[PDB]
Protein backbone atom coordinates (compact mmCIF):
# COMPACT_ATOMS: atom_id res chain seq x y z
CA UNK A 1 0.00 0.00 0.00
CA UNK A 2 2.52 2.41 -1.35
CA UNK A 3 3.22 4.43 -4.54
CA UNK A 4 4.84 2.65 -7.46
CA UNK A 5 6.55 4.06 -10.53
CA UNK A 6 7.16 3.36 -14.19
CA UNK A 7 10.37 3.68 -16.14
CA UNK A 8 8.75 6.54 -18.10
CA UNK A 9 8.44 8.47 -14.81
CA UNK A 10 4.74 7.92 -14.12
CA UNK A 11 3.33 6.82 -10.75
CA UNK A 12 0.26 4.94 -9.57
CA UNK A 13 -1.31 4.52 -6.17
CA UNK A 14 -3.94 1.86 -5.54
CA UNK A 15 -6.87 1.28 -3.19
CA UNK A 16 -9.94 -0.90 -3.52
CA UNK A 17 -9.05 -2.06 -7.10
CA UNK A 18 -8.72 1.55 -8.28
CA UNK A 19 -5.48 3.14 -9.44
CA UNK A 20 -4.75 6.89 -9.43
CA UNK A 21 -2.11 7.85 -12.02
CA UNK A 22 0.15 10.87 -12.39
CA UNK A 23 3.70 11.90 -13.29
CA UNK A 24 6.67 12.05 -10.93
CA UNK A 25 8.59 15.10 -9.76
CA UNK A 26 11.40 14.13 -12.17
CA UNK A 27 8.89 14.10 -15.01
CA UNK A 28 7.29 17.46 -14.21
CA UNK A 29 10.75 19.05 -13.92
CA UNK A 30 11.68 17.68 -17.35
CA UNK A 31 8.54 19.22 -18.92
CA UNK A 32 8.59 22.60 -17.22
CA UNK A 33 5.30 24.48 -16.88
CA UNK A 34 2.44 22.34 -18.21
CA UNK A 35 0.17 24.30 -20.55
CA UNK A 36 -2.36 21.58 -21.50
CA UNK A 37 -3.42 18.12 -20.41
CA UNK A 38 -4.99 15.80 -23.01
CA UNK A 39 -6.93 13.20 -21.00
CA UNK A 40 -9.12 10.23 -22.01
CA UNK A 41 -12.89 9.89 -21.74
CA UNK A 42 -14.38 8.22 -18.67
CA UNK A 43 -15.12 4.62 -19.63
CA UNK A 44 -12.07 4.22 -21.90
CA UNK A 45 -10.60 0.72 -21.81
CA UNK A 46 -6.81 0.63 -21.45
CA UNK A 47 -4.21 -2.12 -21.74
CA UNK A 48 -1.00 -1.76 -19.74
CA UNK A 49 1.42 0.28 -21.86
CA UNK A 50 -1.39 1.73 -24.03
CA UNK A 51 -1.37 5.48 -24.76
CA UNK A 52 -3.98 7.37 -22.80
CA UNK A 53 -3.16 11.03 -23.36
CA UNK A 54 -0.39 13.60 -23.37
CA UNK A 55 0.94 16.60 -21.49
CA UNK A 56 2.13 19.75 -23.28
CA UNK A 57 4.68 22.36 -22.20
CA UNK A 58 6.65 25.00 -24.12
CA UNK A 59 9.51 22.49 -24.22
CA UNK A 60 7.79 19.30 -25.37
CA UNK A 61 4.87 16.93 -25.45
CA UNK A 62 5.06 13.93 -23.13
CA UNK A 63 2.93 10.96 -24.14
CA UNK A 64 1.15 9.18 -21.25
CA UNK A 65 1.12 5.37 -21.18
CA UNK A 66 -1.11 3.34 -18.92
CA UNK A 67 0.67 1.64 -16.03
CA UNK A 68 -2.19 -0.89 -15.78
CA UNK A 69 -4.86 -2.70 -17.75
CA UNK A 70 -8.42 -1.60 -16.87
CA UNK A 71 -11.05 1.11 -17.37
CA UNK A 72 -10.89 4.89 -16.80
CA UNK A 73 -13.27 6.03 -14.02
CA UNK A 74 -12.32 9.69 -13.50
CA UNK A 75 -10.20 12.46 -15.04
CA UNK A 76 -8.95 15.49 -13.21
CA UNK A 77 -11.31 18.24 -14.39
CA UNK A 78 -9.24 20.94 -12.58
CA UNK A 79 -6.48 20.53 -15.20
CA UNK A 80 -8.53 22.27 -17.96
CA UNK A 81 -8.22 25.67 -16.27
CA UNK A 82 -5.22 24.90 -14.06
CA UNK A 83 -2.86 22.57 -15.99
CA UNK A 84 0.04 23.81 -13.88
CA UNK A 85 -1.27 21.74 -10.96
CA UNK A 86 0.80 18.96 -12.53
CA UNK A 87 3.96 20.93 -11.68
CA UNK A 88 2.85 22.32 -8.36
CA UNK A 89 1.36 19.15 -6.90
CA UNK A 90 2.38 16.20 -9.10
CA UNK A 91 1.62 13.56 -6.43
CA UNK A 92 -1.60 15.12 -5.05
CA UNK A 93 -3.72 17.84 -6.72
CA UNK A 94 -2.14 17.28 -10.13
CA UNK A 95 -3.20 13.64 -10.50
CA UNK A 96 -4.29 12.81 -14.05
CA UNK A 97 -6.71 9.85 -14.15
CA UNK A 98 -8.23 7.15 -12.00
CA UNK A 99 -9.07 3.69 -13.32
CA UNK A 100 -10.18 0.30 -12.18
CA UNK A 101 -7.42 -2.22 -12.78
CA UNK A 102 -8.22 -5.71 -14.02
CA UNK A 103 -4.92 -7.60 -13.51
CA UNK A 104 -3.37 -7.04 -10.07
CA UNK A 105 -0.24 -9.09 -11.01
CA UNK A 106 0.75 -6.08 -13.15
CA UNK A 107 1.72 -3.98 -10.16
CA UNK A 108 4.44 -6.50 -9.35
CA UNK A 109 6.17 -5.36 -12.64
CA UNK A 110 6.48 -1.70 -11.57
CA UNK A 111 9.06 -0.01 -9.63
CA UNK A 112 8.96 0.41 -5.86
CA UNK A 113 9.80 3.87 -4.60
CA UNK A 114 13.18 2.47 -3.47
CA UNK A 115 13.92 1.20 -6.99
CA UNK A 116 12.74 4.52 -8.46
CA UNK A 117 15.06 6.41 -6.06
CA UNK A 118 17.95 4.28 -7.28
CA UNK A 119 16.86 4.77 -10.91
CA UNK A 120 16.80 8.58 -10.83
CA UNK A 121 19.97 8.74 -8.68
CA UNK A 122 21.78 6.69 -11.37
CA UNK A 123 20.28 8.80 -14.18
CA UNK A 124 21.28 12.10 -12.52
CA UNK A 125 24.84 11.07 -11.49
Curated annotation (Swiss-Prot):
Q: Which residues carry this modification: N6-lipoyllysine?
A: 59
**One CC-aspect GO term:** glycine cleavage complex
Lipoyl-binding domain residues are: 18-100
Q: Report disulfide bridges, numbered on this chain.
A: none
Q: List locations, semicolon-separated.
A: Mitochondrion
Mind listing the UniProt keywords for this protein, alphabetically?
A: Lipoyl, Mitochondrion, Transit peptide
Q: How is the cofactor bound?
A: Binds 1 lipoyl cofactor covalently.
Example GO biological process: glycine decarboxylation via glycine cleavage system
User: Which cofactor does this sequence's record say it needs?
Assistant: (R)-lipoate
According to its UniProt record, where is this protein mainly located? mitochondrion
Protein function: The glycine cleavage system catalyzes the degradation of glycine. The H protein (GCSH) shuttles the methylamine group of glycine from the P protein (GLDC) to the T protein (GCST). Has a pivotal role in the lipoylation of enzymes involved in cellular energetics such as the mitochondrial dihydrolipoyllysine-residue acetyltransferase component of pyruvate dehydrogenase complex (DLAT), and the mitochondrial dihydrolipoyllysine-residue succinyltransferase component of 2-oxoglutarate dehydrogenase complex (DLST).
Q: Subunit composition?
A: Interacts with GLDC. The glycine cleavage system is composed of four proteins: P (GLDC), T (GCST), L (DLD) and H (GCSH).
Q: Which family does it belong to?
A: Belongs to the GcvH family.
Question: What name does this protein carry?
Answer: Glycine cleavage system H protein, mitochondrial
This chain's source organism reads Bos taurus (Bovine)
